[PDB]
Design a protein around this ligand. Structure first.
Ligand SMILES: COCCN1CCc2c(cc(-c3ccnc(Nc4ccnn4C)n3)n2C)C1=O
Length: 338
């Protein structure tokens, strides 16, 4: 039982010679050699069983990735677990190993426009597939985008993913959210549960902006501060934008704010490709109903060199409890790999 950073990984004997990669709230990721396929891989140790929420997230993630098969989406090579429900304390997800992630990359490397264009294309390509499956990733960020030496990109971390539920998206002002603050759409703070595809598009716009400058565009220090940052660049929402906000506390808060002017994209990104700024504007639209859709984004002039509808596949089969019972469902989903 090899140990990484005081954490025991029961992945032997197929997987030997382990190296640490990253640490999650209820899971850890390492690299390891695969003696059966003769290559290093990534292994995710998930220990969710002590909490129901963590158990919910694990089941959904496993279910989705086991259904999904796409070049721009991390798949599951294998799942390791104890032979019995009683002896199962942790679940191990084996995945292809990627050299790095976008978060790591942006910290020290300036991206060329060619790189920005290709990365963005691959994100949207993957996202087209996800959304075609009626699924929402709900946690897109640079750290969840893996890269390799040839600039191939794969979306990872489907823990907060859900089936789209447009008709059950409304909620009140300042309703608590789980996904990464800096990438939350303005509507989350005002009237949305984040059950619509537009939520993912906002996140992609934020990533694009971050690719352009190597700095997060809306770095909120707390819940409402996030909305402030967004308004600080987008400016005051139009009357039209406001008519879609019918819950009064959210509507009256916006109306209470002093008029703010829109900061021009070209002032924020003086070196940016103009077509890139045009698409950025469309992704970062305050009104989620006016926000560009994934397929629309792919057909945008900025991505003309890579756009090919025939080569941007969609899902063949879209998606239509106490902690203990969830453990049982996790057990069953993983039985195939025993
Ligand atoms: C417990 O966390 C759950 C959420 N979560 C975030 C951390 C993570 C996941 C998958 C990988 C992974 C997968 C494949 N290759 C890589 N490579 C890689 C990336 C950076 N550096 N490196 C070497 N990372 N990482 C690093 C993942 O699903």
């Amino acid at each position: 039982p090899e140990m990484v950073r005081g954490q025991v990984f029961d992945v032997g004997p197929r997987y030997t010679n382990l190296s640490y990669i990253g640490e999650g709230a209820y899971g850890m990721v390492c690299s390891a050699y695969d003696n059966l396929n003769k290559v290093r891989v990534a292994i995710k140790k998930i220990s969710p069983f002590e909490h129901q929420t963590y158990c919910q997230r694990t089941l959904r993630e496993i279910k989705i990735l086991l259904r999904f098969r796409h070049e721009n989406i991390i798949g599951i090579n294998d799942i390791i677990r104890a032979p019995t429900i009683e002896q199962m304390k942790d679940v191990y997800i084996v995945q292809d190993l990627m050299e790095t992630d976008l978060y790591k990359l942006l910290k020290t490397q300036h991206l060329s426009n060619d790189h920005i264009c290709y990365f963005l294309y691959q994100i949207l390509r993957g996202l087209k597939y996800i959304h075609s499956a009626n699924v929402l990733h709900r946690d897109l960020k640079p750290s969840n985008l893996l890269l390799n030496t040839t600039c191939d990109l794969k979306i990872c971390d489907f823990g907060l993913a859900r089936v789209a539920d447009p008709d059950h998206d409304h909620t009140g002002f300042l309703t608590e959210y789980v996904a990464t603050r800096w990438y939350r759409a303005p509507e989350i703070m005002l009237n949305s549960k984040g059950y619509t595809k537009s939520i993912d598009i906002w996140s992609v716009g934020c990533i694009l902006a971050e690719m352009l400058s190597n700095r997060p565009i809306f770095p909120g220090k707390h819940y409402l501060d996030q909305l402030n940052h967004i308004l600080g660049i987008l400016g005051s929402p139009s009357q039209e934008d406001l008519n879609c906000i019918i819950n009064l506390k959210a509507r009256n808060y916006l109306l209470s704010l002093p008029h703010k002017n829109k900061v021009p994209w070209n002032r924020l990104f003086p070196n940016a490709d103009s077509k890139a700024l045009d698409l950025l504007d469309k992704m970062l639209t305050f009104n989620p109903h006016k926000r560009i859709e994934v397929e629309q984004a792919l057909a945008h002039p900025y991505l003309e060199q890579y756009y090919d509808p025939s080569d941007e596949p969609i899902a063949e089969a879209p998606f239509k409890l106490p902690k203990e019972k969830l453990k049982e469902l996790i057990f069953e989903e993983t039985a195939r790999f025993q």
